[PDB]
Amino acid sequence: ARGPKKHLKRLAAPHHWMLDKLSGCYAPRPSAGPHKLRESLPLIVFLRNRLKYALNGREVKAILMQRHVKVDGKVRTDTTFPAGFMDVITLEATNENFRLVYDVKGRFAVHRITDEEASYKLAKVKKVQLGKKGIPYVVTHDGRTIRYPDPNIKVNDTVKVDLATGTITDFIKFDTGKLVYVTGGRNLGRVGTIVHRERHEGGFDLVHIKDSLENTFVTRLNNVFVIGEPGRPWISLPKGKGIKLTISEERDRRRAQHGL
Amino acid sequence: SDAITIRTRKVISNPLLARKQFVVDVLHPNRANVSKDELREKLAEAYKAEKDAVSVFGFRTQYGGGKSTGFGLVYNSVADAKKFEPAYRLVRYGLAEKVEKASRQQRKQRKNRGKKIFGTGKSIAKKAARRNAD
Amino acid sequence: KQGFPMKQGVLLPTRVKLLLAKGHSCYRPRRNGERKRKSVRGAIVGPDLAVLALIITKKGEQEIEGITNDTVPKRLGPKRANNIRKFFGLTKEDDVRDYVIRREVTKGDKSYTKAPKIQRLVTPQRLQRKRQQKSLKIKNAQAQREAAAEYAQLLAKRLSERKAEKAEV
Amino acid sequence: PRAPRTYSKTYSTPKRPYESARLDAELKLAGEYGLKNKREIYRISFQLSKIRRAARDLLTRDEKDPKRLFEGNALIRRLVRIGVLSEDKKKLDYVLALKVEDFLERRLQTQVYKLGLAKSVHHARVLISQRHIAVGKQIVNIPSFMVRLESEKHIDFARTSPFGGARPGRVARKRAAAAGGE
RNA sequence: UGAUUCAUAAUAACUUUUCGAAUCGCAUGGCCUUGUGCUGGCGAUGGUUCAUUCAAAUUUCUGCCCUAUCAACUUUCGAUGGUAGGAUAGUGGCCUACCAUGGUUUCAACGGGUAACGGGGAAUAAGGGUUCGAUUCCGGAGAGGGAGCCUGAGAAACGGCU
RNA sequence: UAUCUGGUUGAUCCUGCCAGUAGUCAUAUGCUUGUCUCAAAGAUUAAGCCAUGCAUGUCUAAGUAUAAGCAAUUUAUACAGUGAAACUGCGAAUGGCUCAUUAAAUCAGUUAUCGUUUAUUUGAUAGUUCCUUUACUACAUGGAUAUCUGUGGUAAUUCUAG
Ligand SMILES: [Mg+2]
Ligand SMILES: [Mg+2]
Ligand SMILES: [Mg+2]
Ligand SMILES: [Mg+2]
Ligand SMILES: [Mg+2]
Ligand SMILES: [Mg+2]
Ligand SMILES: [Mg+2]
Ligand SMILES: [Mg+2]
Ligand SMILES: [Mg+2]
Ligand SMILES: [Mg+2]
Ligand SMILES: [Mg+2]
Ligand SMILES: [Mg+2]
Ligand SMILES: [Mg+2]
Ligand SMILES: [Mg+2]
Ligand SMILES: [Mg+2]
Ligand SMILES: [Mg+2]
Ligand SMILES: [Mg+2]
Ligand SMILES: [Mg+2]
Ligand SMILES: [Mg+2]
Ligand SMILES: [Mg+2]
Ligand SMILES: [Mg+2]
C-alpha cells in the first residue's frame, strides 16, 4: 500500500525466529540486507532470544554500539541487520565465533565455531554474467557479487569466500555425489549426497538427495546448497548433522538419554 | 531459624554488557519475603561484588512463602553498571537519582505550543507587548 | 487593509486569491514542495493601503532623529575565507587566523572572548584528506588493473588447456 | 494487537437436562468424591471423553503403522503417569474404557483422604482449600489437582501452618492469650 | 538460458553533454632534490549503470452467495482482433488513425439483488454437512462526497495541496 | 463422546409439522455478583455529525553555527567549546482506524517481468572532461537566501512585505 511497508507484526514474523506469540505487538522487521526477509535472521533475535547475551532490545542495541559484534568481517550497528544462512557472527568480547547454520527442525542453530574456521564463508552461486568493461562477475544467493571468478564457476555452484578480503579461495562444482545442505521448506536443515537432477524446462530443477541414513528426499535446486564431497563437508555442522530423525526415534532418544 | 538460603541459577557471564547475569533463586524457611537490599547484600558477600554493582529485579514469591525466584546481575564495576543499566533500576537501587520532570500530557501540550509558534519567542513577546496598548 | 500583502508583478489595485508554490514570495511552505492558494494584494497602489514600503535611496536635507543620523552596524560578518578576503582587500598571500570581529562578553565578574567558525581554506587537514582520496582513487584503480591482468592470464591458461584437450582426433 | 489469548469452554453440559437416573448417578458420584457441583463431573467427563475420542481415532488407523503407534503410546504413558490407568493395562483399547470414577479417585481431593490425613472427604477438601497440604513442598489448594502417583507418596501436610506442626494457628493463639490474661 | 533482436563488445554519429569528490570528524606518517617541497592513514557522504534487498505494477492457471418474475448482451460514445503510431517505468484498445467483423452465452453470458470487503479462520460437531467470518494475521479498498494534481524512490496521500 | 420426548385420536398406526431439548470468542437484555488468572468491548443504526486536547517529526567525534545565548577557560590573530533559529538532508506513502464500495472484481494458492520501476540495502566499479600541442583558474570559484535584527500591515489565520 502506497509504498514500502516498514513494520513486521509478531504473528506475521517468520516462524524460525522462534519468537513468543505474546510479549509485544511486533517483531523486528529485518531491514534491507544481503538476505531475504523470511530466510534471514536479525541481530536482535540472535543476541536476545537465542544467545540471551542481551535481556532486551535496548541491551542488544548497546552491545551493537559497543561494536564487539561483527557479522562477516564488517562491524554492523543495526539491530535488524539480516544475518542469514552461512553468515559468520563474531563477538570479539567472549571470542564466541558463530556461523549461522540451520537445525534439523529448521530454526537457526547457534553453532559455536572455532576462530580458524570462522574466517571464510561458504556461499552459493546465483548468477554468472559480465558487467561493464566486459568483466565477468559471479553473484551469490548469500549476498555478495565477486568480480573475476574462475571461468568454470557456473550457476548453483558453491564458493569459499575469504571474507576478510572478499575474494575466492576455492569452489565446489554442483554434481552427482557431492555433499549438499538444504535450505527450503520440509527438508530445510538436512544434509545429503545428490543422486539425480531432474532437468525440467523452466519449472524448477528437482534434486533426489540421500542422507547418511540412506533416507531419500527431494528438493528444488534453489533450495539446495553444495557443502562439500561425501565425508568431507567444508563447514562444521551442528549436532545431528542434517540427519533429521523420525518422531518415534526422536522420542526414544529423549527417553533413553536420562542422565541426571 | 532460616538463614536466607540464596542460590544463583543460570549464570551467564557477559563480557559484552560487562556483567554476570543470572536467575536469583532464594529461600525463606519460616521467614516470609526476602527483601531486595538483603538479597543484594547476600550477592555481594557471595561474589565479592558490592551492592553498588549488584542489580536485581523481578521475583514474585512462589506460593505459600518458602521460595522466591528473581533475576539478578552483578556488573564488572559500579561505573559499568551505571552506564548500562536502565535508569529506573538505578533509582530503585538508590545509586542514581529520580529524574524530576513534567507530566507527559503537559509536555505534549508544550511541544504543540512550540510548534504553533515560529522563530524565536522573544519577537512574539515584543509584539504582544506592543499590542498591549491597542 | 484586512492584511494581504502587495505582491510584485501581479497588477490591479485589488485583493486576489492566488496559488503560490515554493520559490516565490507570499508562502512559507510547511511541506518540502507544497503549493497553496493564498490571497494576495495586487502590485498597484490604491486607497485601501495602510502602508507603502519605501526605500529611502538618495538623501535630502533634514535628517530625522535617528533614521539618517545614527548607524546600526552589521550583526554578522564574512563567514567564508573568500568572503573575508573580499571584505578586506588582501589576496591569497596574506595568510590566516585574524580578520574577524572577536567579541568580549561578561557573565558578571569573568570577562571573555568570542570568535566565529569561519569556512573554506587551504586547511592542512583538508589537504591531507584530499591527498588520501587521491591515493585511494589511484591505488584502487591499480589493484583493479592487476586483477584484470591476472584474470586475462588465467583465461589464456584455460584456452591453452582446451587446445591441448582438443588436439587428438 | 498482540495475539488472541486462546481458551476453551472446556467443560460441557449433557445433551438432555433431566435424565433422572443419570442425575441420580451424578449425585452419587458427587457424594463419593465430595464435589461442589455437577460442573466438576461434567469437566471430568469431557476430559475422559476427549481421551476416548483420541483412542477411537487411533484405532481407526492400523496399530503397527506410525502415528497410531507413537501418539497412542504417548497418551497411554501420560495416563499411567496420572495414575488412572493401571500397570496391567497399557494397550490403548484399555484406555478406551477408563470411566469418570477412576479419574475422580486420582484427585488431590481424595488422595488426601485415601492416605488418611483428613478424615471424611469434605474435611480433606476444606483442609486443601485452607492453605494446608503441599504435594511437593509447594502448597496445593486446588481440590481437582490430579495427583501424579509418582508424587503421591510425597503428599504431606504443609511445611508451614499447623497439622504439619510449624505454628499452632490463630484460635490457639487467642486461647493462649486468654490463659495468660487469666 | 528451455528459449531472444539476451548478456555484452565494437563501428557511426548526435547530446539544449548526465556523471567525472573546489565535502565534514579524527589522527598528524614517509623521503629529503632542506623547499615548507612532494608525498601517504582512519573514515563520512555523494555519484554511474550492473547486483541484491526491501519492494512495484502487471500477469498465467483454477476456484465465489441468491435470482430466468434477468436470454440475449457487447458493438453510435472500444466491443473483439489486426496494422501502425501515441503514451507509459514498461506489457497491452491503455489512447489515436486506418481496416476487418468479431467477442461472450443454457458448461447460465448479460442484467438484478445482497441487511457481500476476500481469505486465514469461527460456531456446530459420528460420516457428509450447515451457517457465520465488521473484528488481533495476510491481502484489498476509503479518509464527508466525487474530481484533479504538487513534492517525492514510492501518494493520485487527505493528521499535503486545488 | 451417531440419543429423541408432548401435541389431531373415542382408541390405532402413519404423512406431517408445531413445541420442547443442547450449543454458539452470537448480540441484546433481566435479575443477581465475594476472590485468583485471562480478558473482548460505537462493527450491526448513520462510511452520520463533531467543541477541546493530543496522535510525526528529527542532529551525531563527523552539514552550517561570532544566538550581541549558555557558559568559560590556559589551540583560534580565517575557524575549533556548546548551540536557539533557520536553509540542506531524510521522515512524514509506515503505523493506526474503518468495511462504504466491490461478485471473476477483490481474494486464495499457483505461475510469469525474455514486460518493467525500485530511495533504501549490501556487493560493485569510471587515467580519454582537453580538441592542434611556444606563455593556460588553483594550496580552494561565485553571488544569493534564511536565522537574526530592523522598517510594518491586519478584525483575524501554524499570514509574512521592506
Ligand atoms: Mg523461468
Ligand atoms: Mg571545511
Ligand atoms: Mg498462611
Ligand atoms: Mg542488446
Ligand atoms: Mg504497441
Ligand atoms: Mg461474506
Ligand atoms: Mg457492503
Ligand atoms: Mg474479514
Ligand atoms: Mg456493514
Ligand atoms: Mg487489515
Ligand atoms: Mg464521518
Ligand atoms: Mg484524496
Ligand atoms: Mg484525522
Ligand atoms: Mg495517513
Ligand atoms: Mg445427522
Ligand atoms: Mg385427521
Ligand atoms: Mg382428545
Ligand atoms: Mg425448534
Ligand atoms: Mg457504526
Ligand atoms: Mg521541519
Ligand atoms: Mg496502513
Curated annotation (Swiss-Prot), chain C:
GO cellular component: ribonucleoprotein complex; ribosome
PTMs per UniProt: Phosphorylated.
Record carries keyword Nuclease: no
Keywords: Phosphoprotein, Ribonucleoprotein, Ribosomal protein
A GO BP annotation: translation
Molecular-function GO terms, alphabetical: structural constituent of ribosome
Similarity comment text for this entry: Belongs to the eukaryotic ribosomal protein eS6 family.
Protein's name according to its UniProt entry: Small ribosomal subunit protein eS6
Species, as recorded: Kluyveromyces lactis (strain ATCC 8585 / CBS 2359 / DSM 70799 / NBRC 1267 / NRRL Y-1140 / WM37)
Lineage of the organism: Eukaryota, Fungi, Dikarya, Ascomycota, Saccharomycotina
Gene: RPS6
